[PDB]
Each structure stands twice: as C-alpha cells, then as structure tokens.
Amino acid sequence: GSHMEKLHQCYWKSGEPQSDDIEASRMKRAAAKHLIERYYHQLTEGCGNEACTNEFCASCPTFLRMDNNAAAIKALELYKINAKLCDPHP
Ligand SMILES: [Zn+2]
Numbered sequence: 001g002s003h004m005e006k007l008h009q010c011y012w013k014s015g016e017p018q019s020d021d022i023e024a025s026r027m028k029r030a031a032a033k034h035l036i037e038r039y040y041h042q043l044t045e046g047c048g049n050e051a052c053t054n055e056f057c058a059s060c061p062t063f064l065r066m067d068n069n070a071a072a073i074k075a076l077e078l079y080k081i082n083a084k085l086c087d088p089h090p
Helices: 021-027 030-044 069-079
Strands: none
Touching: 030 069
16 A cells, blocks of 8 residues: 655644645654654664665665764655655565
C-alpha cells in the first residue's frame, strides 16, 4: 500500500471545515519528527544495501557522504524535501 500517498499542507492551525485527508496527513507527517532522526542515523551509519546509488546516505557505494556534524545540517534538509531514506532494514 501507500506509506505516504501525497504530502502537502497549508497550516497546522486548521480550525475550519477541512478535508478527511487532514487527519490522514497529520498521522503520516507525525513520523516526520522521527524522519529527521532516521536521516541523521542514515548519514552516519547508512543502510545494508549494496545497490544504494544515493549520496544522501553513508553506505553510498560509489558516491560521497557527510561528517557527523555536517549530517546534523543535512538530516532535516532531507526531511523537508523528502529525499531517499533507505534506512538499515532488519
Ligand atoms: Zn542507502
């Protein structure tokens, strides 16, 4: 299924007759705080993927990565733009 069908918002102060998609958006964007945490973890550790093909990750096979401090800048920078978060899967 859809982990996130489409991301968009106007304001969080939606004290008006808004759509059903509002409660659906706020639950899936509630993960966006931990998205930053998964990003910072990905930019320092990486992912267990050989076919990663993404510089926005420490385990980038032919590509570059950023230092722990530079990863702190890059983590929330990748969260807002919704970059490729592989994340190390079990
Ligand atoms: Zn990766």
